[PDB]
């Protein structure tokens, strides 16, 4: 069951593509703060984990479409990663 590793790879891809496309969509909109790659990657993590502090968010339509993709693919893949971790921890419970 190493497809948890496959889920982790998809999540990292979603995070990286989200960071690249968010900066691409948000630059050109006056007032936008999601405009440099390092903090855009931090924003992708915030969204994939659904934490959503609100220190960063998109204000353009395409940035918000990029966010929707990061929500759908990122929350799903992140859900597969934590599910795997939870099942593994339940396995150690059995060892007692």
């Amino acid at each position, epitope marked *: 069951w190493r497809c948890a590793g496959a889920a982790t790879v998809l999540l990292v891809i979603v995070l990286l593509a989200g960071s*690249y496309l968010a900066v*691409l969509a948000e630059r050109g909109a006056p007032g936008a*703060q999601l405009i440099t790659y390092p903090r855009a990657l931090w924003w992708s993590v915030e969204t994939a984990t659904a934490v959503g502090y609100g220190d960063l968010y998109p204000v353009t339509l395409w940035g918000r479409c990029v966010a929707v993709v990061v929500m759908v693919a990122g929350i799903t893949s992140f859900g597969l990663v934590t599910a795997a971790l939870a099942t593994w921890f339940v396995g150690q419970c059995q060892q007692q």
Partner: antibody
Amino acid sequence: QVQLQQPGAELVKPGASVKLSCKASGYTFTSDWIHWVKQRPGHGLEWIGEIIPSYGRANYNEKIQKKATLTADKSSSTAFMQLSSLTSEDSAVYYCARERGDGYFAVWGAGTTVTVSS
Amino acid sequence: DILLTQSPAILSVSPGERVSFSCRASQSIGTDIHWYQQRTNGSPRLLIKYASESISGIPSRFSGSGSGTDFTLSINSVESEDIANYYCQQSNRWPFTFGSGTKLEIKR
């Protein structure tokens, strides 16, 4: 090595156009943005616009009259700024600069002195 | 659009003194401010990034400080080669903007 090479000067007739070039060297990344900055003699720096060569999209300073058009060519690693229908107000030094997508201008070209005159 | 105010516009100093350049933003921009030096007929050259981080190749006497709206660039013991124009620039919100610049003059 000089990382951004610009021609030294361009003479343009009033009403004519010119295409400035900026040839990049060194490390190039997909996160690279090329910026253009205008400096009239005795004045400060004025941001014109930006382009991401790895994708080709450009944005422009919305506070000044739109006079420039940015393009790039990944083959020659050269960014271009088309200045069209120039007047005396457009006579200035035009720098290009590289930003690694992290907000600051690590590297500047030497600048192209553009004179609009008959 | 972030307005960056550099006041005063000219700074007159004796050699070896400490000098401080002021940059103030029209709203809070965290630490996303960067400093450049431009000598006569030269290109801008990055001195400090992100308000206080040093750049490889810049003398140790250059430092920066501040966050929010008030930022300052400092030269420990000014020297003749520091005679130039100094510009701040913000990257917190689109579009990037430059301050109007401060000239450094040395009283010798």
